[PDB]
Amino acid sequence: AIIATAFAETVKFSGSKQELQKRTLALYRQFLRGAPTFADLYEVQFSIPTIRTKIRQEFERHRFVDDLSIQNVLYAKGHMEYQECINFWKQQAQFLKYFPEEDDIQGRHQPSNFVDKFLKNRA
Amino acid sequence: MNSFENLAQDVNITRSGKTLIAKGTGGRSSRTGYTATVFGANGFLGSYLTAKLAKHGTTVVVPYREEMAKRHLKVTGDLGVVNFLEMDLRNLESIDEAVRHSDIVVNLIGREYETKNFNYYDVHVEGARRIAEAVKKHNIARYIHVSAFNAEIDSPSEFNHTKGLGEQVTKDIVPWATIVRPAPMFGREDKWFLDRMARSPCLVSANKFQETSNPVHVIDVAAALERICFDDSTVAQTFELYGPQKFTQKQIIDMVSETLRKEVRHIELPKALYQAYTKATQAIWWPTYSPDQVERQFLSQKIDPSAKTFNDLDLTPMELPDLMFKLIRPYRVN
Amino acid sequence: DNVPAHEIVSGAPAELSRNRVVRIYQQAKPATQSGEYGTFAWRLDWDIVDVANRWENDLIGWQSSGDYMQATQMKFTSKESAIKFANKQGWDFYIQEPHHRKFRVKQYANNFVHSYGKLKHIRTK
Amino acid sequence: AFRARPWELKKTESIDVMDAVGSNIRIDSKGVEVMRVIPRVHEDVNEEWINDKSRFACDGLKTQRLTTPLIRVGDKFVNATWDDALSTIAKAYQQKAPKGDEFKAVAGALVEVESMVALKDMTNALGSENTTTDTPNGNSAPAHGITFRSNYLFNSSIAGIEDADAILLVGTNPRREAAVMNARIRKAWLRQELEIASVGPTLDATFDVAELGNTHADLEKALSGEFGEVLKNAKNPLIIVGSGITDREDAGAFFNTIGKFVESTPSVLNENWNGYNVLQRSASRAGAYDIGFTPSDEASKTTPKMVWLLGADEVAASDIPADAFVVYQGHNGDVGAQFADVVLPGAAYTEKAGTYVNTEGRSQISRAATGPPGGAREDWKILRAVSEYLGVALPYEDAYEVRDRLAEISPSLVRYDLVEPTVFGDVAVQHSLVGPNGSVTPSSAPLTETIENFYMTDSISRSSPTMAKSSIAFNKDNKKNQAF
Amino acid sequence: KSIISYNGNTIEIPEEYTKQAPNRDSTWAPAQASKTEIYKNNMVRFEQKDLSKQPMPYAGIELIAQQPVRFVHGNTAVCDGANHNGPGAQGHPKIFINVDAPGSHACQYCGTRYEKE
Amino acid sequence: ALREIRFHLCQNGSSSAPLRQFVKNQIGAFQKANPSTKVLVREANGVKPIVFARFDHGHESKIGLDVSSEKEVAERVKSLIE
Numbered sequence A: 001a002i003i004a005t006a007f008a009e010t011v012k013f014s015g016s017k018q019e020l021q022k023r024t025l026a027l028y029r030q031f032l033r034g035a036p037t038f039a040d041l042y043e044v045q046f047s048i049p050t051i052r053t054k055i056r057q058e059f060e061r062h063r064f065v066d067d068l069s070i071q072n073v074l075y076a077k078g079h080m081e082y083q084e085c086i087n088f089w090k091q092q093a094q095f096l097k098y099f100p101e102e103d104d105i106q107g108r109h110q111p112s113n114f115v116d117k118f119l120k121n122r123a
Numbered sequence B: 001m002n003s004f005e006n007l008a009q010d011v012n013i014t015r016s017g018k019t020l021i022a023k024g025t026g027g028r029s030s031r032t033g034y035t036a037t038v039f040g041a042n043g044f045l046g047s048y049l050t051a052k053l054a055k056h057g058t059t060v061v062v063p064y065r066e067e068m069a070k071r072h073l074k075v076t077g078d079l080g081v082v083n084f085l086e087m088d089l090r091n092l093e094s095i096d097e098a099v100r101h102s103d104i105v106v107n108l109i110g111r112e113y114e115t116k117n118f119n120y121y122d123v124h125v126e127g128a129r130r131i132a133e134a135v136k137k138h139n140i141a142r143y144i145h146v147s148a149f150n151a152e153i154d155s156p157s158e159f160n161h162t163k164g165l166g167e168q169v170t171k172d173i174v175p176w177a178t179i180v181r182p183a184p185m186f187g188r189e190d191k192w193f194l195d196r197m198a199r200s201p202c203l204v205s206a207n208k209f210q211e212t213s214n215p216v217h218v219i220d221v222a223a224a225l226e227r228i229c230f231d232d233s234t235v236a237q238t239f240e241l242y243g244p245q246k247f248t249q250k251q252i253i254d255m256v257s258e259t260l261r262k263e264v265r266h267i268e269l270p271k272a273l274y275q276a277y278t279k280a281t282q283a284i285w286w287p288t289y290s291p292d293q294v295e296r297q298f299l300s301q302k303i304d305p306s307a308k309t310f311n312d313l314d315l316t317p318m319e320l321p322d323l324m325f326k327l328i329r330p331y332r333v334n
Numbered sequence C: 001d002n003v004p005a006h007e008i009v010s011g012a013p014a015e016l017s018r019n020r021v022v023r024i025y026q027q028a029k030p031a032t033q034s035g036e037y038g039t040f041a042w043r044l045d046w047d048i049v050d051v052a053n054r055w056e057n058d059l060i061g062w063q064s065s066g067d068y069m070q071a072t073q074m075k076f077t078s079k080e081s082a083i084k085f086a087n088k089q090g091w092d093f094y095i096q097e098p099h100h101r102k103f104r105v106k107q108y109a110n111n112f113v114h115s116y117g118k119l120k121h122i123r124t125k
Numbered sequence D: 001a002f003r004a005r006p007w008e009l010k011k012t013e014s015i016d017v018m019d020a021v022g023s024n025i026r027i028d029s030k031g032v033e034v035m036r037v038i039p040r041v042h043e044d045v046n047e048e049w050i051n052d053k054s055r056f057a058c059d060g061l062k063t064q065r066l067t068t069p070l071i072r073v074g075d076k077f078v079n080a081t082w083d084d085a086l087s088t089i090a091k092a093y094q095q096k097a098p099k100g101d102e103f104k105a106v107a108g109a110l111v112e113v114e115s116m117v118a119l120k121d122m123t124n125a126l127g128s129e130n131t132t133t134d135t136p137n138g139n140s141a142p143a144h145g146i147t148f149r150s151n152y153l154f155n156s157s158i159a160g161i162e163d164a165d166a167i168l169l170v171g172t173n174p175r176r177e178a179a180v181m182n183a184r185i186r187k188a189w190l191r192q193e194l195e196i197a198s199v200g201p202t203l204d205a206t207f208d209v210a211e212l213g214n215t216h217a218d219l220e221k222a223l224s225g226e227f228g229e230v231l232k233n234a235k236n237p238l239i240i241v242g243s244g245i246t247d248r249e250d251a252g253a254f255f256n257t258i259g260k261f262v263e264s265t266p267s268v269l270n271e272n273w274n275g276y277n278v279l280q281r282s283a284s285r286a287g288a289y290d291i292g293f294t295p296s297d298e299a300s301k302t303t304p305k306m307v308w309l310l311g312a313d314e315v316a317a318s319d320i321p322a323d324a325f326v327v328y329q330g331h332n333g334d335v336g337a338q339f340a341d342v343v344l345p346g347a348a349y350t351e352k353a354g355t356y357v358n359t360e361g362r363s364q365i366s367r368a369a370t371g372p373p374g375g376a377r378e379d380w381k382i383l384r385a386v387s388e389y390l391g392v393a394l395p396y397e398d399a400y401e402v403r404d405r406l407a408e409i410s411p412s413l414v415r416y417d418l419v420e421p422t423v424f425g426d427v428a429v430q431h432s433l434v435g436p437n438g439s440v441t442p443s444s445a446p447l448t449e450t451i452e453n454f455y456m457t458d459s460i461s462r463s464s465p466t467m468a469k470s471s472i473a474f475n476k477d478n479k480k481n482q483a484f
Numbered sequence E: 001k002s003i004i005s006y007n008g009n010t011i012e013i014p015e016e017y018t019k020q021a022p023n024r025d026s027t028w029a030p031a032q033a034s035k036t037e038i039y040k041n042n043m044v045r046f047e048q049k050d051l052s053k054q055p056m057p058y059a060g061i062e063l064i065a066q067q068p069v070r071f072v073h074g075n076t077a078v079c080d081g082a083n084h085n086g087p088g089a090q091g092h093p094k095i096f097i098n099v100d101a102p103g104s105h106a107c108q109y110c111g112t113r114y115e116k117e
Numbered sequence F: 001a002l003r004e005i006r007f008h009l010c011q012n013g014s015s016s017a018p019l020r021q022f023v024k025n026q027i028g029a030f031q032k033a034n035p036s037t038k039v040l041v042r043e044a045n046g047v048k049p050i051v052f053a054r055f056d057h058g059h060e061s062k063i064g065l066d067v068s069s070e071k072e073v074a075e076r077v078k079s080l081i082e
């Protein structure tokens, strides 16, 4: 037969929110645990605390989503991502997509008020 | 969507009366409207500067000497952004062809040893004089001239002496040129710095590795150069780009050893013996440590009291201790 | 009513649902043709962005674009379906209500009506 | 001819701005330039037709364009950056030091409502009330008043012409001011009995008209005469007043006579039918009046030290003081830009999604076909930025906030494609037309034609080679256009 | 010869390469960019390049203007631009041209001019 | 106000009836009372009776005119003008 691969979890939509939050916290713990493995695999310049900070931000972004089905989908995609990272399927190029802030300063002019945006036709 | 991070605004007017209108969001397919000639573009710093310039689609004219050394520069720009011109310092028409159509001219041409064809004078003073004459004759809007830190006319070192003379002749010819003096630059595959410390059989100093300078990341020098390129308020100013904190050569070697998990071999020799050795090895065809380099091994960095710095470009240099691991990673062995 | 940002499971950029406006409408009867086959579907397409719509390459003279939606246009069977879709994606929209030809009775015999007074115009056929 | 094929054209539904009718058009563009303009059906405005100017003046949008800011230095303009321009405006403002009504603002025939709103708000925040229109006598307030919409609109809808039994045209030539409406009047006249009379210049009409004279006295005679009786008896009468009469100094007398006649005759103005109609010629006049873009009484007395032209290409040498600092904001190079000290490029009607209010008072929304050329910008953004440089920063920096401010100014700007009749029909006439116009003395000067040349009336139309060729090809004294 | 650039500097071009075609000096369509303008706008990519090697095909407008007018008896001239030597259909679609008006009337496909005599 | 007053009101709405009456009857009295202010009456179906006053340098203020009587409309306006 075709058997599942490493860190594969069968797709299951939780019927109750609480049973989903259990899995969600497990997944968060897995990501935090794997952070050093990610730092070794992908030869990152930045520190393990920064990996963990990024993970916390990612989990934070959906902290107020209510409808259960959307939470189920987000959890499934988060697990798919975890499996992608931990198995070194991803390369450094795609991994660093997650990390747009640690790249250097892109330039002198990042407009913030209406006059600087207007001068660059981005108002 | 992307953004023209280097440009302050959309419509621009060069000092020469050209109207430049940036098109597009600011990505590969966009065009800033500027045209720039980068002398010495295929070198260590020129490559980064060219990558930053062609990232936003300003036309980059690259004068080159060897065809095979410049090939990596074509990748950095869209079709027709990076243009290549055959050039030689003893062919005036070639220089004229290189600078003729540009709004910006920066020259990074400098050599840390002497050759059978170009001695320090020929490469730093007469070369700069010819480039600056082409600039003045074609009335180029912006001319940026890069020299070295510690550039002084009456220096012990022929390198610093010729650099100071080059600065003087540039100022005499083009009164509106901008002079930059970067500190020792490090970074990936640098020259006579970190990479040398990482794979040398032995580093031999004639002055106990005591010399102090503020090393600066090459990316930061290139970004500062770009900023100087695109703001017209830096005309006729002098810039002293240097790193945050002052280091001793021995300190850097100790940091490299700690980051390399391997001990770097240091041997101290008398100055006369090491001179004779370097003067002897100057007979081979591949670049090797100069006699004047070891002369410079007795000069510590001197920062001009009255000179614009990274702060005036709203920039903050990165730290050499922070990059260490990123900059020397392939030699750890572990 | 409208799906907020960051619970859309499509994966599209946030800018799409933040600062872009789509328009929903029916195509107008083309003035050049009498056929009406294209006028029943409810199109949905994006209003253009000023800086990123189209510029001219300085080499071969082509139309460069930074707007990734300039060519996209969805078809829907009905106005309510288009509204529901745009709402489910979080897109700000505007509805352009269609215009139709007002019915009037046309008689061929009207071309030959007797005129009791002076002729207002000479019909010619 | 031969410039494109239908499958490669991007089709955008937008609004024509050549006249004040507000024809609905489809803009076919490929890439960065506009190919053609074709009509789309709106049975309540243009039916399925547009006039030749609206169709063929598109070629004026790709020539004589403004692309970079310009600054006058000596007797020549020099290109300059947006920052340099706007800082020059700020420095001229601080040096001139205008107090109150010394900052004049003029709006041209083509501009959108959002741009007018921005300009008026900024000018008010400078302490000025000198928000003028571009027409002759536009330094003064209009004689028909601004308080009620029905004072300056086509109160009978454009579809109202279908029901007409009698029409009196006062100082207006619809064939030139509103061509599709002229076709509408013609169709009505062909298919039912209908009586048309006019006061004003002898006009070549597609329908039989009765000429009652060229003078205000002739209007008095008519309204007291046989045609006044015809209007009294009519079931759906309507009186059409040209915008060209509003531009006369004696506009008060005409508006007074007409208001008295209307307030008398119930057929002309009852609760089911308002026969009083003003026919604007410019696409922007209705919106301007809607937001109160009208100078104050004391403003017309002052001599401005700074003038801001928004469009404003009908301006003369006389209306600008020599010492004034003039800012021009537009999309084409015309006489107005020639007069300026700083020129700012703004988007054209095909390059922005604006609101236009037609003669009916109908509010319509356009859609941007292409982006502005060069370094040109959206007009209300220009005003917002310059106001920030002037220290009077406008409270909105986003299109939705712009629509909110528009809702604040009037609730009918945000209701699109909707006409709703006025409940104040009887109050408006008395309060605005007959009330304050008692003192005005009618002149003895005869009424003249409002527009000398139908084909060239705007900046776009004067920038078009096609309109130039059409004007010289379709001249009356050319035998190709005679018949006999 | 000497075209001033946007820089204010001078660009020198031989006279032969400013002609739009070898046989015609000036443009033949309003939107067509003249050689002078081409160089002014692309001079960076034309440096150290040999202009005599560039394509420069002949302007067909003059070549068709050198072909003599064909006189026809009737009111209609039929043209299809066929190749009587080779097989197959090698011309352009067969159209008929009315020649009652004064002067020569050009084939819409090939430009060959006809006249009624 | 000193410079501008704007009246918003529905045409058919019941909540606008005191507004329609106030306009229809004392619009002339209000205009003559404040001869330099510019008065605008703008109507639309869905909108709730509101009034806007513009005093100086763009400062504006508004009050809701969901009111029972033409009188009460008048004192709401007067309270705005002060």
Ligand SMILES: NC(=O)C1=CN([C@@H]2O[C@H](COP(=O)(O)OP(=O)(O)OC[C@H]3O[C@@H](n4cnc5c(N)ncnc54)[C@H](OP(=O)(O)O)[C@@H]3O)[C@@H](O)[C@H]2O)C=CC1
Pocket (backbone or CB within 6 Å): B039, B040, B041, B042, B043, B044, B045, B046, B064, B065, B066, B069, B088, B089, B107, B108, B109, B110, B111, B118, B123, B146, B147, B148, B149, B182, B183, B184, B185, B191
């Ligand atoms: N790196 C440092 O630590 C410091 C460097 N600088 C200055 O920075 C600039 C460049 O730094 P870096 O990029 O490291 O130097 P590189 O040697 O890396 O590049 C220098 C450039 O000089 C060109 N060049 C040298 N001589 C000639 C010549 N005679 N004719 C034509 N081209 C010539 C080289 O071209 P080719 O490859 O064809 O020889 C090369 O492109 C130089 O001016 C240097 O003096 C100043 C202070 C510190």
Ligand SMILES: [Zn+2]
Pocket (backbone or CB within 6 Å): E079, E080, E081, E092, E107, E108, E109, E110, E111, E112
């Ligand atoms: Zn043919």
